[PDB]
C-alpha cells in the first residue's frame, strides 16, 4: 500500500527520465552528423550508423559501413575537397541542421526522428580551380530528413538516416530560376563506384527540385493525435476560384 | 524522518520530470506548427490550438479554428496554391523554426515561448504563372514568436499564436534595398473575407520592415533574473559621437 | 535491500534529472545570448557571463563585465546603432542560433558546448547614411561556438564565449566573391579602445574566410566514443587523383 505506491513511482520516473534521455541522444546523433558532414569527415559519419545501417540519398540505399563510407567519401569527400578531411581553404559546406521532431517507441528500443537542413555551399575564387564543372560555384540546398533509431546494446545509433532534397538555389539567381544540379540515381554499385546498393522501388523514386513530393510526418499530430482528421477542419475555410 | 524523506525527493523529482516533459511538448508544438505551414495544411494547424485560442498576424486577432482556418485556409491557402493541400510543383513555403526559449508557469498549467522563423518562399520559373501580382517571384521573411500555452485537460495546446515579422528581402536585392509587400491589417472579417476578427489596439499596431520594434522578452534574464538592472553595466561602455 | 535500493534508484534519478534540467539551463544561455545581441543589448549579455569570464572574438580575449561591455557596448553597439539599445529603424543584426552540442562535466560544476549561428545583418536603404565605411551595406555571415560553463553557486553561466567566425559574403555577391571584411585582432587595450585585453598565442590566431581552420569538437563521437578511430573508416573509401 505504502511501499507498493512507491515503487509505482520509481518505475513512472524511471521511465519518463530515460525518455527524455533518449530524445536528447537522438537529437545528438543528428546535430553531430551534421557537424562531421561540414567537414567532409565520412568516418565518424560511418560510426555514427548499425552495421546493418542503411542512408538514404536521391532514392539510393547505401548498406553499411562500406555504404557510407562511398557515399560520403568516395563520392562527396572526393567531389568537395579532392579526397581530404576538412575543413579545408576555401571551401564552404554548411549544413545547418533545425527542428528535430522525435517519437520514441514505447519499448524504448527504436525511434524515429523527423529533421530539416539548410545547406550554405560553395568554392572561394581562390579554389574555384578546384571545383568540378557539373557544379555550381556557391548554391543554397534543403532538405528533409525521416530518420530511424535502434538502441543496441544500450547505445542509440543510426537505423537508417534519409535524406531528401526539397530545392537548390544557384547563389546568383535562388531557387526560383534554379533546377535541382542532383537527379534521382540510375547505376547501382559495383557498376557505378559512387552509386547506391540498391534503388528505392520505382513508385517511390522521387524527382527532383521543381518537382515536389509530400514526406509524410513520421510524427502524430501533437494535441489531436489518432483523432485528428483533416475534413473536420477544412469546410471552416473558403477555396477561391483563381 | 526517513519515509518522509523518501517521499519528499518524490515529489520534487515528479515536479522537475513533469517540467521537462512540458518544455519538450511546448517546442513541439512549434516545430509541428512549421511542417504543417510549409505545406500549406491548415487543417492541422487549426487543430494545434485550443477553441478559444487567438492567432496574431499583421496585429490582426483570428479567433478560434474558424478564425485560424481563415488566416491559413482562405487567406494563405489560396494565396500560395490555389487552394490546394502543399507540397504542390515549383511551390516553397519553408518557414525553418528555431531558438526557443520556453517559461513553464510554476503550477504546470500556462507557458509562454519566445521562438523565430525564417522563411525561404517563392515560386519556380515553371509555376510562375499561379503566383498574385502583390508578392515577389521569390523572397526572404523573418519574424519572432512571443507565444501563450495552456495544459488544457494535461494537454498542451496554443492559447495564444503571435508572429511578429521582421524583415522581408526580394531575393535579387535582399532585405537593404525591401520594403515589406505586407502592413499593418487594416479591414477586419467579416468585411474582409481574409481579415481578422479583431485588430490590436491603435497603441500596439506594429508597423513594418524597415520600421523595427521590440518584441519584448517572455523570458527572465537567465543569470541574474530579477536581479539583472540595465543601469548596472551601462556606464562600463563608452558612447561615441558619430 | 529493499530500502537500500529505492535509495540507490532515488540518487540515480536525481542525478540523472539534475543533468537534463542542465542542458536545458547552458542551451538557454546561448539562445537568450542571441537575442540580446539581435537587440545591441550589451549590459544583458555582460549578466550572462561569470565575473573572470573571457569572450574570444577574432582571435582577442575581452575580460569580465568591463571587457564585454568593451566588445559588444563600446565597439559593436557604436558600430550598428550609433549606440542606442535597439532594436532600432532599418537595422538588421539577426544572429540565428542553432545546433547545440552540450557535454556537461561528471561533477556537474562546468560544461561545454558547440553551438553556431548565421547572421543576417544590414542597413536599409533609409538608415544607410548611419553604416560606416569599412562595413557592407548588407551581408551573411557564420560562426562556430565551443563555449565553456560554469555552474556557480548552482547558477549556469559562461565561463569563456569563443565566437570563431567561418565565412562572410555580402548579399549582392556571396560568400564565394567575398574576403572577410574582419581580420584577427591585432592591437590591444588600452592602445585600442576596441580591443582585447590580451591577444590569443600566435600559433592558436585564426586567418579569417577565405582561409579555414578546423574547430575541434568539444563532444565525443556520440555511438564509438573513445573507441572511434579515423583510421579504422579511411581504408573503405576510395581517393580519386584529381
Ligand atoms: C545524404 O545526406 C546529405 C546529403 C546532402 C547533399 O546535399 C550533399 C551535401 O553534403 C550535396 C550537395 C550538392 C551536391 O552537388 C552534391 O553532389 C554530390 C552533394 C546534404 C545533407 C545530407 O545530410
Ligand atoms: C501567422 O504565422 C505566420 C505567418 C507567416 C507569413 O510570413 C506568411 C508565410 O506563411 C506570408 C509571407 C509572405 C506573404 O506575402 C504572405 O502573404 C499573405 C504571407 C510566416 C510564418 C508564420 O508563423
Ligand atoms: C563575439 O560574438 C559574436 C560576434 C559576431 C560578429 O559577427 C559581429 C555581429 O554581432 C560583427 C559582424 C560583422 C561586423 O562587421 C562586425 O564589426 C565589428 C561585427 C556575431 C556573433 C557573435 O556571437
Same mark, same amino acid.
Given at each position: 500500500?505504502? @511501499?507498493?505506491?512507491?515503487?509505482?513511482?520509481?518505475?513512472?520516473?524511471?521511465?519518463?527520465? %530515460?525518455?527524455?534521455?533518449?530524445?536528447?541522444?537522438?537529437?545528438?546523433?543528428?546535430?553531430?552528423?551534421?557537424? *562531421?558532414?561540414?567537414? /567532409?569527415?565520412?568516418?565518424?559519419?560511418?560510426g555514427l550508423?548499425?552495421?546493418?545501417?542503411?542512408?538514404?540519398? #536521391?532514392?539510393?540505399?547505401?548498406?553499411?559501413?562500406?555504404?557510407?563510407?562511398?557515399?560520403?567519401?568516395?563520392?562527396? %569527400? /572526393?567531389?568537395?575537397?579532392?579526397?581530404?578531411?576538412?575543413?579545408?581553404?576555401?571551401?564552404?559546406?554548411?549544413?545547418?541542421?533545425?527542428?528535430?521532431?522525435?517519437?520514441?517507441?514505447?519499448?524504448? %528500443?527504436? !525511434?524515429?526522428?523527423?529533421?530539416?537542413?539548410?545547406? !550554405?555551399?560553395?568554392?572561394?575564387?581562390?579554389? #574555384?580551380?578546384?571545383?568540378?564543372?557539373?557544379?555550381?560555384?556557391?548554391?543554397?540546398?534543403?532538405?528533409?530528413?525521416?530518420?530511424? *533509431?535502434?538502441?543496441?546494446?544500450?547505445?542509440?545509433?543510426?537505423?537508417?538516416?534519409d535524406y @531528401?532534397?526539397?530545392?537548390?538555389?544557384? *547563389?546568383?539567381?535562388?531557387?526560383?530560376?534554379?533546377? !535541382?544540379?542532383?537527379?534521382?540515381?540510375?547505376?547501382?554499385?559495383?557498376? /557505378?563506384?559512387?552509386? =547506391?546498393?540498391?534503388? #528505392?522501388?520505382?513508385?517511390?523514386?522521387?524527382?527532383?527540385?521543381?518537382?515536389?513530393?509530400?514526406?509524410? @510526418?513520421?510524427?502524430?499530430? =501533437?494535441?489531436?493525435?489518432?483523432?485528428? @482528421?483533416?475534413?473536420?477542419?477544412?469546410?471552416?475555410?473558403?477555396?477561391?476560384?483563381?
Amino acid at each position: 500500500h505504502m @511501499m507498493a505506491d512507491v515503487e509505482t513511482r520509481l518505475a513512472e520516473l524511471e521511465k519518463k527520465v %530515460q525518455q527524455l534521455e533518449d530524445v536528447n541522444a537522438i537529437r545528438r546523433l543528428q546535430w553531430a552528423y551534421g557537424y *562531421y558532414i561540414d567537414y /567532409n569527415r565520412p568516418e565518424e559519419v560511418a560510426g555514427l550508423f548499425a552495421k546493418d545501417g542503411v542512408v538514404v540519398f #536521391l532514392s539510393g540505399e547505401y548498406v553499411g559501413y562500406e555504404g557510407v563510407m562511398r557515399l560520403y567519401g568516395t563520392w562527396f %569527400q /572526393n567531389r568537395f575537397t579532392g579526397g581530404r578531411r576538412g575543413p579545408v581553404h576555401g571551401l564552404l559546406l554548411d549544413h545547418f541542421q533545425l527542428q528535430d521532431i522525435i517519437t520514441v517507441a514505447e519499448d524504448g %528500443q527504436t !525511434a524515429k526522428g523527423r529533421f530539416r537542413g539548410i545547406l !550554405a555551399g560553395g568554392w572561394h575564387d581562390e579554389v #574555384l580551380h578546384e571545383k568540378p564543372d557539373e557544379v555550381p560555384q556557391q548554391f543554397w540546398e534543403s532538405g528533409l530528413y525521416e530518420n530511424d *533509431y535502434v538502441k543496441e546494446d544500450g547505445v542509440w545509433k543510426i537505423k537508417r538516416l534519409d535524406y @531528401m532534397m526539397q530545392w537548390q538555389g544557384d *547563389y546568383e539567381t535562388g531557387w526560383a530560376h534554379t533546377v !535541382a544540379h542532383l537527379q534521382p540515381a540510375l547505376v547501382c554499385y559495383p557498376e /557505378n563506384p559512387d552509386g =547506391p546498393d540498391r534503388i #528505392l522501388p520505382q513508385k517511390d523514386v522521387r524527382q527532383t527540385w521543381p518537382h515536389r513530393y509530400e514526406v509524410p @510526418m513520421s510524427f502524430a499530430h =501533437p494535441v489531436l493525435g489518432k483523432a485528428f @482528421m483533416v475534413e473536420n477542419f477544412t469546410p471552416m475555410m473558403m477555396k477561391k476560384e483563381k
